[PDB]
Amino acid sequence: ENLYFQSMINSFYAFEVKDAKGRTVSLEKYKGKVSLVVNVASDCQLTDRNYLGLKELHKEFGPSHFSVLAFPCNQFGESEPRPSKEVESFARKNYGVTFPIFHKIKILGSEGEPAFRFLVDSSKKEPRWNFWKYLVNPEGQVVKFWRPEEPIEVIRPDIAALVRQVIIKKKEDL
């Protein structure tokens, strides 16, 4: 390598992504928050349990110190066939979630969304289905991942522990 060019991209929150309406949004707005980043889908065996679980986590720990950041993707069993604006309304209509549902992305292949590839390259784990989960710390570093089969009961303790530290730091540091 060259030392000069090592570690050029260090934070998930450095990226721009499209929102569900197609507008460019910077993830810098989530800087200082804990984020659970998840690839989602509407037409999947796992859809219901995941939207319900993610809603519960966001309600408990969000929105000041924590967010769920949801990225729809159609690459896993073609489980997100509808347009991005419909996916967002699906989630809001059926679950009443208030966490962000971004534009549909690609994750696998040459055209993989750079922000999500950051998660993959950091964790060394590429999703193999809908609803893989990545924990991003206040500094934008990926510190943990979960496979879709892991229940909320084994995700919540890491979120609680990280959110606790954020709350203390916001209080104590200027």
From Swiss-Prot:
Entry EC number(s): 1.11.1.9
Q: Which UniProt keywords apply?
A: Acetylation, Membrane, Oxidoreductase, Peroxidase, Transmembrane, Transmembrane helix
Q: Which reaction does it catalyse?
A: 2 glutathione + H2O2 = glutathione disulfide + 2 H2O
Cite the active-site annotation. 44
Gene Ontology molecular functions: glutathione peroxidase activity; peroxidase activity
Q: How does it sit in the membrane?
A: Single-pass membrane protein
Which is a GO BP term held by this UniProt record? Answer: cellular response to oxidative stress
Instruction: Say which domain of life the source belongs to.
Output: Eukaryota
Location of this chain's protein in the cell: Membrane
The enzyme's main class, written as a single word, is oxidoreductase
Give the GO cellular component terms, alphabetically: endoplasmic reticulum lumen; membrane
Q: Does the keyword rRNA-binding apply?
A: no
Which coarse location class describes where this protein primarily resides? membrane
What protein family is recorded? Belongs to the glutathione peroxidase family.
Q: What is this protein called?
A: Probable glutathione peroxidase 8
- Organism of provenance: Homo sapiens
Question: Source taxonomy lineage?
Answer: Eukaryota, Metazoa, Chordata, Craniata, Vertebrata
Q: What is the primary gene name for this protein?
A: GPX8
